[PDB]
Nucleic acid binder design. Structure first.
Ligand SMILES: [Mg+2]
Ligand SMILES: [Mg+2]
Ligand SMILES: [Mg+2]
Ligand SMILES: [Mg+2]
Ligand SMILES: [Mg+2]
Ligand SMILES: [Mg+2]
Ligand SMILES: [Mg+2]
Ligand SMILES: [Mg+2]
Ligand SMILES: [Mg+2]
Ligand SMILES: [Mg+2]
Ligand SMILES: [Mg+2]
Ligand SMILES: [Mg+2]
Ligand SMILES: [Mg+2]
Ligand SMILES: [Mg+2]
Ligand SMILES: [Mg+2]
Ligand SMILES: [Mg+2]
Ligand SMILES: [Mg+2]
Ligand SMILES: [Mg+2]
Ligand SMILES: [Mg+2]
Ligand SMILES: [Mg+2]
Ligand SMILES: [Mg+2]
Ligand SMILES: [Mg+2]
Ligand SMILES: [Mg+2]
Ligand SMILES: [Mg+2]
Ligand SMILES: [Mg+2]
Ligand SMILES: [Mg+2]
Ligand SMILES: [Mg+2]
Ligand SMILES: [Mg+2]
Ligand SMILES: [Mg+2]
Ligand SMILES: [Mg+2]
Ligand SMILES: [Mg+2]
Ligand SMILES: [Mg+2]
Ligand SMILES: [Mg+2]
Ligand SMILES: [Mg+2]
Ligand SMILES: [Mg+2]
Ligand SMILES: [Mg+2]
Ligand SMILES: [Mg+2]
Ligand SMILES: [Mg+2]
Ligand SMILES: [Mg+2]
Ligand SMILES: [Mg+2]
Ligand SMILES: [Mg+2]
Ligand SMILES: [Mg+2]
Ligand SMILES: [Mg+2]
Ligand SMILES: [Mg+2]
Ligand SMILES: [Mg+2]
Ligand SMILES: [Mg+2]
Ligand SMILES: [Mg+2]
Ligand SMILES: [Mg+2]
Ligand SMILES: [Mg+2]
Ligand SMILES: [Mg+2]
Ligand SMILES: [Mg+2]
Ligand SMILES: [Mg+2]
Ligand SMILES: [Mg+2]
Ligand SMILES: [Mg+2]
Ligand SMILES: [Mg+2]
Ligand SMILES: [Mg+2]
Ligand SMILES: [Mg+2]
Ligand SMILES: [Mg+2]
Ligand SMILES: [Mg+2]
Ligand SMILES: [Mg+2]
Ligand SMILES: [Mg+2]
Ligand SMILES: [Mg+2]
Ligand SMILES: [Mg+2]
Ligand SMILES: [Mg+2]
Ligand SMILES: [Mg+2]
Ligand SMILES: [Mg+2]
Ligand SMILES: [Mg+2]
Ligand SMILES: [Mg+2]
Ligand SMILES: [Mg+2]
Ligand SMILES: [Mg+2]
Ligand SMILES: [Mg+2]
Ligand SMILES: [Mg+2]
Ligand SMILES: [Mg+2]
Ligand SMILES: [Mg+2]
Ligand SMILES: [Mg+2]
Ligand SMILES: [Mg+2]
Ligand SMILES: [Mg+2]
Ligand SMILES: [Mg+2]
Ligand SMILES: [Mg+2]
Ligand SMILES: [Mg+2]
Lengths: 115, 137, 48, 100, 154, 50, 110
RNA sequence: CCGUGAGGGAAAGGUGAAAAGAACCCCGGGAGGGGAGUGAAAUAGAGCCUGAAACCGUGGGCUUACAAGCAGUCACGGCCCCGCAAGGGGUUGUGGCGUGCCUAUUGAAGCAUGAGCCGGCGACUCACGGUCGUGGGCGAGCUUAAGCCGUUGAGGCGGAGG
RNA sequence: GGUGGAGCCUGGGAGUGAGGGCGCGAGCGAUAACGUCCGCGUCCGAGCGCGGGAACAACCGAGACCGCCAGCUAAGGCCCC
RNA sequence: GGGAUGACCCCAGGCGGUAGGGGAGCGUUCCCGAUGCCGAUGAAGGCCGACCCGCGAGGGCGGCUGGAGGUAAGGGAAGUG
């Protein structure tokens, strides 16, 4: 029995090219340049999944820090105040509070400055 | 739960006297304002942030010997085309420009950082266009 | 000697080359005597 | 009114009637779940300490999920090393009933 | 590449033509060239230990006997082979053609009478093998046969 | 028994080492021979028992 | 209702003839007729035939009313290439491709 | 076809059950097409089964002329589409991040090899010994070879020998 | 004391036998070399995966099973980029 | 450990990786299974898919094309990616 390539290799390539849809020039059209682009795009996705977690925190901080500089203190002191006050709530993700719930945010400043 | 992002805000306006303020220390602040990093809805990709008007440039003061000793450089594409302009000569020729170049160098690079610069309007001495709003320092 | 292209030029860079290649239609006047159309300042193909 | 609760090492802002997805917790669908006694009222003052002690949030376990598959790929140039792994992340869907 | 039709000639000078580098075109890297390591004639036979065929024969009957699917018969009378005549004796035998039957008898007349049934395979006794016992749902022998099947094991 | 369930014991087939099909898949490229000279070469070495 | 002519295996290089087809597209058959006459390229000869065969196809086949015809769609696809040997210096021999157009004029009513 | 010659040496198969292989008409010099007709099917129409990919073209959605780059990825937003909806698909404005694959190397994005792209061909085998392991058979024993009989996908016998 | 992807014994399969930087001890060199040759350690090699050092295999930090729009740290940082 | 003697639940750990070793699998051609089974109410092959199953290699399922083949469970052998 001879088993020649037949259907197999075409399907393999088709799979990758589907994944490459939308890439520029040959990178979507050619099984190789597609495959090469994907290697990148797969390690970037993993890298940026790790670093989406960093990217968001940095934004929350800039926003927290911005809002309590409005009430006259640092970010750095504010966090200490909350560490003191036991208020390990904030989970910097809730600068949702800082924007939508200003008076909730202000009461947190106060609880913070008592230390 | 998704992080909040503004819809279209309206631009606030500000006015700064700059007489006797130093330079980089004034520039720092103008930078953060231009970015909008005081507003605690600040977002990096948007251009939500104050326009800034500055009067009494030419009246910025600087420490050290920098008026004689600090040189700005400009390279033309051409051989020997590096020009060296000492600070005092700039102020005597195009005052402002000295703040403008100080704030430009302190805004982020890119298409957006290049727009924020467009929102900084710097004049020598007093006055300006009057039809916006403008609180103070 | 013998210069040669270092990279096959892209489908875009060539079609961008051809951004000027378009023809313009012939410029035509209606024939003063005859019905038909003529390039100006030439002799009408019908009724010279 | 609103509440800031903590489930799965994460904090979310819950109003009553809000449907939301959460790191998967152990309970049958349709059972009722009492969310740890949380961190903030939407009527303000009540903040305090780790957790306001005795006020709760109740939510209906609507069912258990598996998220849309993420492909986790790893490639190391010139070493002939590639790994391909599909991963979809189990969840539980909740409906927020009342803030106690 | 040694057995293919083409010449032994080197196709190109090997340096300076700007091309890759080759020998004869019989080389397996060429379309139309020789095969690498592909099939040649070979003999798949080996000698299974006789004790293992002896056992597996006995075991294969036993597996049928333990199912109750073995039946020994005497003499038929569905003989003078006509598949109509066999089909009668098979009816009285309770073989309705609903299960494949392996029929072992030395009687050439009964053999040809069943030969053409889709559900019957037939053998002389001296050719009893296990592959045919396992293929068939029901095993059927006569009193000869079964006698030599016996003397064959042990 | 019947031909469907016949089958061998859980040892007894094994069923062997490819070598030089893909990466990861272990053996691949250099085909477990590892990086250049004589032993990797087709006729390989000189009969190591002498 | 539309009518179409396709000239197939026209011996001409698609790039060359596509250029005049680009001249008369979405144009009323009457200007298209004028444009081709006074366009100077060997491509106008060919498109003109296809135009006309399609205009003729409109009236005698699809009941389309000559006065309301314009070129609704049109294009040239590229048929099989005739390949010929071109002898060069130092024994060389390149292949020129004499190429082939499939010209399509599609007509509609305004 | 190539070579003076010995000699080298290819490509190249498939309409349809059936030619019923498209009369006639229309544009055209023909080619080609368009109707008509045949056919279950005519993008089965003879450059004919299926008809992939590179490649070229027409049309539509999003997009782009003050931005700069291994071309992606993560985020948010705009527009277009699918939907009951928190939904999803497309596209990409701005922001963060980001040094092609293979090979060979102490070390490569590397200004070191290789590759224009796509499709198909393409490299750890087989025999006979050996030596380990493993699945079973029999076990102070194990086992047959060539042959011979039988069978025509039936097996048995054969003890030289090892 | 130490239960460790420890150790020892028999046997099947390997690959390697071009190393490199840094630190410390020497020789050779000129108290030259991104020099060369040894010793003991380390890291790169194979961790050109991650943070810091502007950028940078081997310096500092740290050994990446997968996911998270959560928290605390390391080195290094906290005027603006 | 649970006492199901487990194919599973619970607890605790390990899981960067070239040469290289080991282990499990995916798929391709052919064989037995096959005088069978799927098939014109449509085989193989092709084109889609945002759906299902699988870590993955893959397997499904739907639609379009195509118009005569295909081949389960379980096992065998190779011109097998
Ligand atoms: Mg075949
Ligand atoms: Mg092959
Ligand atoms: Mg982190
Ligand atoms: Mg804290
Ligand atoms: Mg790299
Ligand atoms: Mg690799
Ligand atoms: Mg030969
Ligand atoms: Mg020969
Ligand atoms: Mg010959
Ligand atoms: Mg020779
Ligand atoms: Mg070359
Ligand atoms: Mg040939
Ligand atoms: Mg051949
Ligand atoms: Mg049968
Ligand atoms: Mg049968
Ligand atoms: Mg292995
Ligand atoms: Mg390996
Ligand atoms: Mg080896
Ligand atoms: Mg090699
Ligand atoms: Mg070696
Ligand atoms: Mg050789
Ligand atoms: Mg050799
Ligand atoms: Mg010439
Ligand atoms: Mg000549
Ligand atoms: Mg060419
Ligand atoms: Mg001759
Ligand atoms: Mg035929
Ligand atoms: Mg009909
Ligand atoms: Mg078709
Ligand atoms: Mg057809
Ligand atoms: Mg063809
Ligand atoms: Mg047919
Ligand atoms: Mg065809
Ligand atoms: Mg195509
Ligand atoms: Mg277009
Ligand atoms: Mg400009
Ligand atoms: Mg613009
Ligand atoms: Mg970007
Ligand atoms: Mg290479
Ligand atoms: Mg080399
Ligand atoms: Mg070298
Ligand atoms: Mg070197
Ligand atoms: Mg280069
Ligand atoms: Mg290169
Ligand atoms: Mg070179
Ligand atoms: Mg070399
Ligand atoms: Mg290929
Ligand atoms: Mg081998
Ligand atoms: Mg052997
Ligand atoms: Mg052996
Ligand atoms: Mg034994
Ligand atoms: Mg005989
Ligand atoms: Mg060890
Ligand atoms: Mg060993
Ligand atoms: Mg040596
Ligand atoms: Mg070597
Ligand atoms: Mg050495
Ligand atoms: Mg050394
Ligand atoms: Mg020291
Ligand atoms: Mg050195
Ligand atoms: Mg030194
Ligand atoms: Mg030294
Ligand atoms: Mg060392
Ligand atoms: Mg190495
Ligand atoms: Mg390396
Ligand atoms: Mg290490
Ligand atoms: Mg590098
Ligand atoms: Mg760094
Ligand atoms: Mg580093
Ligand atoms: Mg490193
Ligand atoms: Mg680890
Ligand atoms: Mg674990
Ligand atoms: Mg590992
Ligand atoms: Mg390890
Ligand atoms: Mg049927
Ligand atoms: Mg039918
Ligand atoms: Mg087939
Ligand atoms: Mg199909
Ligand atoms: Mg089958
Ligand atoms: Mg092969």
């Amino acid at each position: 029995p001879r088993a020649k390539t037949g259907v197999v290799r075409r399907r393999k390539h088709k799979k990758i090219l589907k994944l490459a849809k939308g890439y520029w020039g040959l990178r979507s059209k050619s099984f190789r340049k597609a495959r090469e682009t994907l290697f990148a795009a797969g390690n970037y996705a993993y890298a940026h999944r790790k670093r989406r977690k960093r990217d968001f925190r940095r934004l929350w901080i800039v926003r927290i820090n911005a809002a309590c500089r409005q009430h006259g203190l640092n970010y750095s002191t504010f966090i200490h105040g909350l560490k003191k006050a036991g208020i390990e709530v904030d989970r910097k993700n809730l600068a949702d509070l800082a924007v939508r719930e200003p008076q909730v945010f202000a009461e947190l400043v106060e609880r913070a400055k008592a230390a | 739960m998704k992080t909040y992002v503004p819809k279209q805000v309206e631009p606030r306006w500000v006015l700064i006297d700059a007489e006797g303020k130093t330079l980089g220390r004034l520039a720092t602040k103008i930078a953060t304002l231009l970015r909008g990093k005081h507003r605690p809805d600040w977002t990096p990709n948007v251009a939500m942030g104050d326009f800034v008007v500055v009067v009494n440039a030419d009246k910025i003061r600087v420490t050290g010997k920098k008026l004689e000793q600090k040189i700005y450089t400009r390279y033309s594409g051409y051989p020997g085309g590096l020009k060296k302009i000492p600070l005092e000569k700039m102020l005597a020729t195009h005052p402002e420009r000295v703040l403008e170049h100080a704030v430009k160098g302190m805004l982020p690079k890119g298409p957006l950082g290049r727009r924020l610069f467009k929102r900084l309007k710097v004049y020598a001495g007093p006055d300006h266009p009057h039809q916006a709003q403008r609180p103070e320092k | 000697k013998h210069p040669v292209p270092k990279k096959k030029t892209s489908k875009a860079r060539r079609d961008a080359r051809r951004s000027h290649h378009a023809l313009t239609p012939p410029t035509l006047v209606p024939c003063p005597e005859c019905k038909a159309m003529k390039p100006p300042h030439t002799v009408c193909p019908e009724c010279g | 009114m609103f509440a800031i609760v903590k489930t799965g090492g994460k904090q979310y802002r819950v109003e009553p009637g809000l449907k939301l997805r959460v790191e998967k917790l152990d309970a049958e669908p349709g059972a009722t779940v009492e969310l740890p006694v949380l961190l903030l009222g939407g009527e303000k003052t009540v903040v305090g300490t780790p957790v306001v002690e005795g006020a709760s949030v109740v939510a209906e376990v609507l069912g258990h999920g598996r998220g849309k598959k993420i492909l986790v790929s790893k490639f190391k140039a010139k070493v002939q090393y590639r790994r391909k792994k599909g991963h979809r992340q189990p969840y539980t869907e909740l409906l927020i009933k009342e803030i106690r | 590449r040694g057995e293919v039709a083409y010449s032994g000639r080197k196709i190109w000078p090997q340096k300076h033509t700007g091309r890759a580098r080759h020998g004869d075109i019989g080389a397996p890297i060429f379309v139309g060239g020789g095969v690498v390591f592909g099939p040649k004639p070979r003999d798949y036979s080996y000698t299974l230990p006789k004790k293992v065929r002896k056992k597996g024969l006995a075991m294969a009957v036993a597996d049928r006997a333990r199912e109750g699917k073995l039946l020994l018969v005497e003499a038929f009378a569905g003989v003078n082979g006509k598949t109509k005549e066999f089909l009668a004796w098979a009816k009285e035998a309770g073989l309705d053609g609903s299960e494949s039957v392996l029929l072992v008898t030395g009687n050439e007349l009964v053999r040809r009478a069943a030969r053409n049934l889709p559900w019957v395979v037939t053998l002389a006794p001296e050719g009893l093998n296990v592959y045919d016992i396992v293929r068939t749902e029901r095993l059927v022998m006569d009193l000869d046969a079964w006698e030599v099947f016996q003397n064959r094991i042990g | 028994m019947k031909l469907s369930d016949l089958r061998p014991n859980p040892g007894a087939n094994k069923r062997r080492k490819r070598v030089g099909r893909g990466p990861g898949s272990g053996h691949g490229k250099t085909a477990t021979r590892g990086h250049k000279g004589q032993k990797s070469r087709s006729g390989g070495l000189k009969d190591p028992r002498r | 209702m539309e009518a179409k002519a396709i000239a197939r295996y026209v011996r001409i290089s698609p790039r060359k003839v596509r250029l005049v087809v680009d001249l008369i597209r979405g144009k009323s058959l009457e200007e298209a007729r004028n444009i081709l006459r006074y366009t100077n390229k060997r491509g106008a000869y060919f498109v003109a035939k296809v135009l006309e065969s399609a205009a003729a196809n409109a009236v005698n086949n699809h009941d389309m009313l000559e006065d309301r015809l314009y070129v609704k769609a049109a294009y040239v696809d590229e048929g099989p290439a005739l390949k010929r040997v071109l002898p060069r210096a130092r024994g060389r021999a390149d292949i020129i491709k004499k190429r082939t157009s499939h010209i399509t004029v599609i007509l509609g009513e305004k």
